[PDB]
């Protein structure tokens, strides 16, 4: 098992985020910050007189989880091809597609910029699509649980077209996303920060000539992937990794002494063909196994 060369490619493709300042006269400018001074400290705020703040990125749902990228062995080839093909039938792509979509819908990718906000609205723009712009208005007081989304006019088609994008070979689904944040006057905005191996240096880009912060493309890929609450006695959803690492406290769950990490389940691949040919925990760890093949990564020793 694990024959020294195995790797997958990712299946979710988020981009950078861009901050624009809309004026009352329907004019949009890029949100620019200030620097203060080696030792350098940055400061960003909403300019006075502005209505609200806009954000736009894009994400794609492709099908690179059906076969690996390099495989080195035709016994780990047809085994992992059969697992993703049997999970499509007995379980279905419903429980994963709903969890990834809600973190796009409820503004989870706005990390700490929603605290002290009056109202924010999020508009999707799917493709391929015959119909209308999809809306999610006043999300704090209208959309809070899995059921408020299921009452929507356009939830049956956007849980769909991701389910086909994982099931059909050479599939594709692309979402444009836009959000408007009604923040109070002179409110602070929190973008991503440059690493600077040992403060608060912003990750910037050039939009229309002047510099503007981004809040990252690996930063917004972490927010969508927080769907993991199958580690034992789970209280909070974590980001999908091989050893269940939590960031705020520097512990990690999912440790190999427990027997619940990825490399002690991936070795057990032949065991799970038998049951799927059971709804207690043999399901609740394939949701962790499928969310690792959608993640990517080199799997080799």
């Amino acid at each position: 098992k694990l024959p020294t060369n195995l790797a997958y490619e990712r299946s979710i493709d988020p981009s950078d985020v861009c901050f624009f300042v809309v004026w009352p006269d329907d004019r949009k400018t890029p949100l620019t910050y200030n620097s203060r001074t080696p030792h350098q400290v940055d400061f960003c705020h909403v300019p006075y007189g502005a209505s609200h703040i806009e954000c736009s990125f894009s994400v794609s749902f492709s099908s690179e989880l059906r076969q690996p990228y390099k495989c080195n062995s035709s016994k780990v080839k047809q085994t992992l091809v059969q697992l993703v093909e049997l999970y499509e039938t007995k379980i279905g792509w419903t429980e994963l597609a709903t969890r990834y979509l809600m973190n796009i819908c409820n503004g989870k990718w706005l990390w700490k910029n929603t605290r002290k906000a009056y109202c924010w609205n999020i508009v999707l723009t799917p493709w391929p699509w015959n119909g209308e712009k999809v809306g999610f208005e006043d999300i704090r007081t209208n959309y809070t649980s899995r059921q408020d989304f299921k009452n929507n006019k356009n939830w049956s088609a956007i849980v769909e077209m991701i389910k086909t994008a994982f099931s059909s070979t050479d599939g594709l689904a692309i979402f444009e996303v836009r959000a408007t944040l009604h923040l109070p006057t002179n409110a602070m905005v929190r973008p991503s920060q440059v690493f600077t191996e040992k403060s608060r240096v912003f990750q910037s880009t050039t939009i229309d000539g002047e510099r503007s912060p981004i809040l990252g493309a690996f930063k917004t890929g972490a927010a969508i992937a927080t769907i993991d609450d199958w580690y034992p006695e789970a209280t909070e959803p974590l980001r999908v990794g091989r050893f269940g690492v939590h960031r705020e406290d520097v512990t990690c769950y999912r440790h190999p002494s427990t027997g619940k990490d990825f490399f002690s389940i991936l070795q057990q691949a032949e065991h799970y063909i038998e049951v799927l040919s059971p709804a207690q925990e043999t399901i609740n760890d394939m949701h962790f196994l499928m969310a690792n093949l959608i993640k990517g990564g080199m799997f080799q020793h």
Partner: protein, 197 residues
Amino acid sequence: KWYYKTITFLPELCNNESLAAKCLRVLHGFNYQYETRNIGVSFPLWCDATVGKKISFVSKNKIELDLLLKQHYFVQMEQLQYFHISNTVLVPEDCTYVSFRRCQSIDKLTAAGLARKIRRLEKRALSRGEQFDPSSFAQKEHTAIAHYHSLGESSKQTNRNFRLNIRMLSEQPREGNSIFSSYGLSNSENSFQPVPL
């Protein structure tokens, strides 16, 4: 013929801002009961990073400096020996020579302070004509601020955590025959009065 009251700031675990303010807040209660204008700033061990221990008190009428010194703070901090009284000595007339002045420019640089500013410029242009926008008001990218050793202070009347900003200027051998104010100054309405340290 000035005096000086050298203090000693000993106990090795102590803040340099909260104790230089509270020894000045007990000076701030003064000049609201005995309204004088004569007591200065005079840090002997000012340095660049992490200002040191000693502060002093300088005046020419030079008997209120002991009247200020017994005002329910050294009579309240006496036994657990944080500080002690100096020897009340005439200042020798050849020494180093600095000046302490409130800058107050730094306070109107922070992003809340510039929104505090362009709010005021909105209303005082009530003589009409143009219809201006707040779009053409910005701080650009670059303000290089080295060091100013801020001193935080709570307001007397209300609950505001305001702050002071005073730096070093050492020249000009003749201004200010003891024309200080409530906090001790070299900027406002009188002179740029230097200090003999």
